[PDB]
Paper text:
Similar to its homologue YefA in B. subtilis, RlmCD can catalyze m5U methylation for both U747 and U1939 of 23S rRNA, whereas these two modifications are catalyzed by two different enzymes RlmC and RumA, respectively, in E. coli. Our structural evidences indicate that RlmCD is a MTase that belongs to the RFM family. All together, our in-vitro experiments confirmed that RlmCD is a 23S rRNA MTase specific for U747.
In this structure, each asymmetric unit contains only one protein molecule. It is composed of three distinct domains representing the residues 1–63, 128–261, and 281–454, respectively. The central domain comprises a six-stranded β-sheet (β6 to β11) stacked against two α-helices (α3 and α4). The C-terminal catalytic domain exhibits a typical SAM-dependent MTase fold in which the β-strands (β14 to β20) of a seven-stranded β-sheet and α-helices (α5 to α10) are connected in an interleaved mode. Most strikingly, compared with those in RumA, the linker regions between α3 and β8 (linker A) and between β10 and β11 (linker B) in the central domain are evidently longer in RlmCD. Careful structural comparison between RlmCDs and RumA revealed the noticeable differences in the lengths of the two linker regions (liner A and B) in the central domains.
Residue numbers in the entry: 1 to 453
Write the structure that this text describes.
């Protein structure tokens, strides 16, 4: 029976969703960082639980031909790129396999085509938004990212999967915070001023918003700091302050202040302009979010007479992306300011057939149906937990023939598919999309239809 710090020769026989190698020794299932299937390693036992254990590679005996040798290990240990040590073609095959297995094991479905995962051509340097903690590390204010399962900042300048100009702004801000003697936040002490930096840069527009996330309102000589950072980065259009005075894992507090310029940037997606506030949700991989939405559009076979419900519409990106293709878009969104933003974004693009309600999806559907609206397509991008039975039955009660389910969690998608099948919908096609390349994340578009069943 294995002990911690034992060294055992194992063959890696599987890979978890989150990118851990799997070995099976002495009745236990071991999870091993930075170890790929068919690799043979000397494994250092780090921890033994009842049915599972944890290990480390002491030495590679056989390295996989699918290993990417050039990845800095910082990106695995920060969880920035959980699959970054796997060749990109095998990353895609793995995400495809996971979708297929979920549909079979959860929904009992084995006869539906699952397309190979849509990948990114140069799957690096892509995020249009940084959220970096600011902490003192080794006595110096640093920017970086937390080690996995911790709040220990790893100082980083190159974030691998982030816009390099954003990386440069974060470094310039780091150095200005140092020159101006501004103190980083200390979670244990609840001391200091600077908690986080959020930097958004338009993928297409290059417009930059700097958010200083601070514990207190007053930031000494911040006007001179702003004066100098905009000298280095004239593309900065907004310097915002968010005050978070709470002991919480949430990034943002309630109060926002504009210190310079605008309180938003403008960026483009599928040909439309979007005004993006500090706390708005906006896909960080614009290049692949465009392909994701294009996939749902293609699956739904959108016609100019279709009436679309954009369920959980946010600041409007999905419905406004399809608005030019369909008769009417009805968006439901629970957050009123998001509805405000989606109305502004419709107006900015002169889109007049997109209408938003702030309500629950069930109540909006009830009222829309009472108003005579006859939905024909529902586009829904549920949270990780999937849809409720109430939502599924309500969406089915609308009579909508096609439902494009944009999932960030294949497991809850397969569960929801089962109920839609009981309700008379057929699962027609499935397309995984690599929305977050180099990571574990599997995004899936599923087409459900009660036509031709």
């Amino acid at each position: 029976m294995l002990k911690k710090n034992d060294i055992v020769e194992v063959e890696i026989v599987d890979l978890t969703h989150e990118g851990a190698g799997v070995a099976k020794v002495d009745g236990l299932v071991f999870f091993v960082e930075n170890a790929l299937p068919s690799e043979k390693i000397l494994m250092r036992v780090l921890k033994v639980n009842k049915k599972i254990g944890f290990g480390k590679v002491e030495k590679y005996l056989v390295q996989s031909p699918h290993r990417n040798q050039d990845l800095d290990l910082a990106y695995l240990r920060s969880g920035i790129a959980d699959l970054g040590h796997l060749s990109y073609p095998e990353q895609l095959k793995f995400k495809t396999k996971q979708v297929k297995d979920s549909l079979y094991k959860i929904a009992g479905i084995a006869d539906v085509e699952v397309a190979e995962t849509l990948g990114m051509e140069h799957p690096v340097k892509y995020r249009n938004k940084a959220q970096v903690p600011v902490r003192r590390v080794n006595g110096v204010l640093e920017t970086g990212f937390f080690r996995k399962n911790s709040h220990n900042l790893m100082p980083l300048e190159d974030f691998f999967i982030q816009d390099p100009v954003i990386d440069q702004v974060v470094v310039a801000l780091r150095d200005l915070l140092r020159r101006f003697d501004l103190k980083p936040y200390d979670e244990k002490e609840q001391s200091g001023l600077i908690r986080n930096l959020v930097v958004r840069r338009g993928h297409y527009s290059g417009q930059i918003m700097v958010v200083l996330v601070t514990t207190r309102p007053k930031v000494f000589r911040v006007d001179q700091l702003i004066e100098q950072v905009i000298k280095q980065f004239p593309e900065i259009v907004s310097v915002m302050q968010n005050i978070n005075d709470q002991n919480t894992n949430a990034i943002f507090g309630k109060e926002w202040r504009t210190l310079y310029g605008q309180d938003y940037i403008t960026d483009q997606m599928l040909g439309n302009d979007f005004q993006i506030a500090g706390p708005a949700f906006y896909q960080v991989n614009t290049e692949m979010a465009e392909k994701l939405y294009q996939t749902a559009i293609d699956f739904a076979e959108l016609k100019k007479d279709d009436v679309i419900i954009d369920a959980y519409s946010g600041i409007g990106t999905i419905g406004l992306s399809v608005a030019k293709h369909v008769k009417e878009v009805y968006g439901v969104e629970l957050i009123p300011e998001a509805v405000e933003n989606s109305q502004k974004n419709a107006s900015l693009n002169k889109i007049t057939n997109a209408h938003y309600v702030c309500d629950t999806a069930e109540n909006a559907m009830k009222k829309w149906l009472k108003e005579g609206i006859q939905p024909t397509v529902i586009l829904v991008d549920p949270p990780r937990k999937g849809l409720t039975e109430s939502f599924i039955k309500a969406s089915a009660q609308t009579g909508a023939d096609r439902i494009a389910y944009i999932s960030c969690n294949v497991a809850t998608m397969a569960r929801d598919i089962k109920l839609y099948q009981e309700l008379g919908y057929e699962l027609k096609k499935v397309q995984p999309v690599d929305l977050f390349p180099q990571t574990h994340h599997v995004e899936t578009v599923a087409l459900l239809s009660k036509l031709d069943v």
